[PDB]
Each structure stands twice: as structure tokens, then as C-alpha cells.
Amino acid sequence: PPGTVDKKMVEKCWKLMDKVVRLCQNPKLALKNSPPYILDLLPDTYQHLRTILSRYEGKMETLGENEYFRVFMENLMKKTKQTISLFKEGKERMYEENSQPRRNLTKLSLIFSHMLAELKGIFPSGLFQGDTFRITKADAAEFWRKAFGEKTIVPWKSFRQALHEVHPISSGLEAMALKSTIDLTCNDYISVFEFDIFTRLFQPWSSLLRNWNSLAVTHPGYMAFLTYDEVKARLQKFIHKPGSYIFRLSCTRLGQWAIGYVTADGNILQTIPHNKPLFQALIDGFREGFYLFPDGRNQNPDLTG
Amino acid sequence: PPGTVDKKMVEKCWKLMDKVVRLCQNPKLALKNSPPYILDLLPDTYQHLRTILSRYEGKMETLGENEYFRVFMENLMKKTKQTISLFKEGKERMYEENSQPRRNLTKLSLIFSHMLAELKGIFPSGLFQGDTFRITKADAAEFWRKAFGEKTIVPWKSFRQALHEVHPISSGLEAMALKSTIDLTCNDYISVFEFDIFTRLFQPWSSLLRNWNSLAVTHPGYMAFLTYDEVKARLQKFIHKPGSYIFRLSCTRLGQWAIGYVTADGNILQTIPHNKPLFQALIDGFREGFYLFPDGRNQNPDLTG
């Protein structure tokens, strides 16, 4: 993996993070408070990094050499550099919302949220427990343990070939689609944390990639790195077409689905389905007249097989 | 409309707003954090005004002359002056809760919430899009467009005569009741935003004023400019009379209804009905034993016609 994490690199990273903070306090950006909110995320990430350092008082050599922590720190440093490049190389299109540069800052925001979530899953309370992480579906737990043991983080290639023995991937293009879905921190590493998220979202394990095919790859309602405010904004054009709906990953309850939909009374509501898989929510909502037109489209996929 | 908005007037307004802030940090007031909270509202309003100015860097002449923005700024300035008068001309009855002066500060609070909401609807992201605002019910959309085109804001008189051609108003007293309901920012102007709120609340459009007659004008459960904390406080006297209920506009989800009710287990709960109009919620809740005694009264209106 990347290099060992010393004090010099943590104090560089914070200085990068504080630069992204200053950039992001531009009033022309019109940043709204809702998650994911980069103005809370960077400060919160520093705080959890303070926590880790504090509990590794003495044992810095152990922490500095930890594999996950080295990959994490590199991801964090790379992403905060991408955000600084994005502002600089975007000059004034950062301010026109629905410019590409601006969509790119929202996507980073989400990535900064997914990274903080992963770091807290792996280091709850500032201490490394990647090696005892609990994978939430038992079959998926068995897969990881048989393939990688108690490893916290594995390169994409090695993950893809392990997955491929049990759940065959059809092609190069399907594999790249798969990668973008799972690899929430976008760093070409698959964590036990990102694996947990993906197999909870696309359970049951016994048909994993067919489930991911129907709900994401071939479904017009699925929306990849979208936020709550983006879903609301996207549905506005269908305000007069009750039953229009889209769905995505929840950013604050990672592992759970969030469905957005236009009601018959002129509201745009967002829900998080409980005690039922997305399929069943989608089927029943169609049957009850709520989830009819995915992304405002007139046909809806028949998930009833 | 009012005068053009220059730098001198924005810096006056902020100075007024900061005076209301200082007044409102009196510990004798016992202000609670819940929405609507004047201590978050004024600061937030400044922030969105910072945002607007920032995106009109250069084009101040365009912004300064915008019709809605001129009316807004006047409303904001008038209301912050009323609040300063209220403290000064209230001397020490501001501190006795359930004094009139104190109820008047709560009502202003709500008004400051409704204004901020209108300003964000009309200037989402700091840019003026009153002219493309989406009215949420299609019929109501047609009405506005046929009557006023793409105007953002119209004087009450002109609004009343337009409404009156399609939905006849019975009398002067009914017209004044109507005005107080719709005119959420209390400035004798009806925005496309306030119109949207009113027709979402009292839909369907085809019986608009009968709907507003049954649910507000003649219903003992309707409560005009009340907050969540006021509803809770008002229901306390009926704590031992399960089924007592009141309803009002939600302040944080403008356009939606919030029902307050005393349960059979000694709780006071507040709900926001979804995928059904207030009528249906009221009828079904009566039939299921939840919403029985409006404002603790023994008879309940029969909405089942």
C-alpha cells in the first residue's frame, strides 16, 4: 500500500483540508446545510483523526504502519487535492449551479461523507478494529472471511477475481459498472466496510449481481452519486406528474435505500424503506399507485420476477 | 412598488436586524430553540441576503430594481422595526408569557420564518427565478398564469379581484379572513410563493373557498399563526381528555398541515399528514378515535359532505 503515515503527512493533510474549507465558504456557492455538507465533514474528519492520534499516543509506529490507515490517509489527501484542483481549474463555473464543475463538487461532498463513515466504521472510538468488523449479512460474511480472512481492505483486482469465482461477472463493462457502485470512496480499494454496504443494499447474497442488475444497471429510477437535495431538485420537473419516482443510496444511513416521489397533493417526499428489501417496496408502491414512473418515464420495469 | 434597493438600505436593514437579535437574547424571555427561532432566523436571512448580493456582483442595478426584491426588502425592514417597537413599547410585559406583547413576538417569529421561506423559494441559490416558480397544483398554476402571467408578486386588491372572478368571495369580512390566511408575510402583497402555499393547503382548486371555509373559517380546531410549542402548550389543559385535537400550518414544511392531539396514554403528539388531504385525515382520525374534540370542544364538525 501507500507510504507510512507520520506527523509530517497528517499536518500536510489538515492544511489541505483547511484550504478546501476556505474555498467552500464562498457565498457565491450557495451551499445548503443538508447532508452531505462539506463544511461539517472536513472539521468532523479532523476531529476523528484527532481522536485516533490521541489513542495511539506512544504507539504511533503501530498506527503509522496499519494498512487501512495508510490507504485511508492517501485517499483523504488525494480527494482534498482534487477539490482544490476543481476550484482552481473551474475559475467561475463553480458558481453556476448545474455547471459540471459544480456537480463535481457535490459528488466530492458525498465522497467525503462516505470516507468519514468508513473511517468511523473501521476506527470506532479512535481504535482500529477493522479485523473484527461485522459484515451484516451472514453469507456475505462467510464470503469475505473465506476469501480474505480478517483483512480490512483489498485492491479492486483481487476483490473482482474473488467475487468472480462465486458470482460471475459478465464482461469488462459490467465490471466497471460494479466497481463504481461498490467503490464509494473512489480509490480502487474495496473495504470490508464498502463490501458490507454493497451486500446489504443488494441482498440477498444468493442472487447478488442479478439483484444489482435489476435495481441499478437496467433501472431508470436508480440514481448513482445523488444527494437528498439533488433528488428533490430533479423531481421538480415532474411536480405535476404524481407517481414519478427515483431512488438512491441514503448518505446518512449508509446501507439503506432512500426513495424520492411526487405525491398526488403536490408534495415531494423522501422515505427510507424498513423491514423489506427495495424490490418489495418498489413492487408494492407500484401496485398502490405511489411509485409509477421512474425518473418521470412512462414505463416501469416489472420486478415481479 | 417601494423604492430601489441600494447598499445604504441593506446596511440599514442589517443594523436593524442586529438590534432585534440583541433584544432577543434577553434571558428573561426564555426563548426555546424550536422553529420558529428568531435567533437562527435573522442570521440566516442575512446569510441568504449575503448570497444574493454576491451573485449580483456587478449587476446590482438589475437586482436593486427587481420588483419582488424591493417589496421583500421593505417587508423585512418594516417587520424588524415593528419588533423593535414591540420591545420598547412593551417595557416589561415582554417577559410575562401569555402577555399580549409576548404573543406578538411569537407571531413575528413565524412571520420572519415565512419571509425567509419566500425569499429562498424566489431566490434559490441567490438568483432570481420568481418568473419560473412552479405552482404545485396544475389548476392553480393555470389560474396564476392566465391572471398575472409570470409576475412574482401582486397587490392584494388585484389578487382579490382576479380570484373573485373564478372563486367568488361572499363579503368584505370573508375577504379579510382570506387575506389574513394567505398573506403569510403580512405585507398586503400576495406572492406566487404564498399563492402556492394556500392552494396546496386548501386543494382541490375546484372548491377552493368552500374547502377553506370548512377547515379554517368555521372549524374550531384550526389555529392561525400558531407554532409547535404553542400547540403543545394549548393542549395541556386537555391532557386528561384523550381525543382533543388542533391543527395549523407547519412552519418548517410550509404547504403541509400539522395536527396536534392528546393520546389515550397521556402523550401530546404532532403529526404531518401524507398522501391524503386534511379532510380525509380529519374524517378517518375521527372514525378511529384520535381526533374527536376540536380545541377540547365536545362537538366535532361533520366533514363527511
Binding site: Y261, L269, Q270, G285, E288, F290 | -
Partner: peptide
């Protein structure tokens, strides 16, 4: 935090 409401009616 954002507004998530109960599944539809």
C-alpha cells in the same frame, strides 16, 4: 438532518 417520512400510505 434531511426529512425522511414514513413509507407511502
Amino acid at each position: 438532518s434531511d426529512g425522511y417520512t414514513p413509507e407511502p400510505a
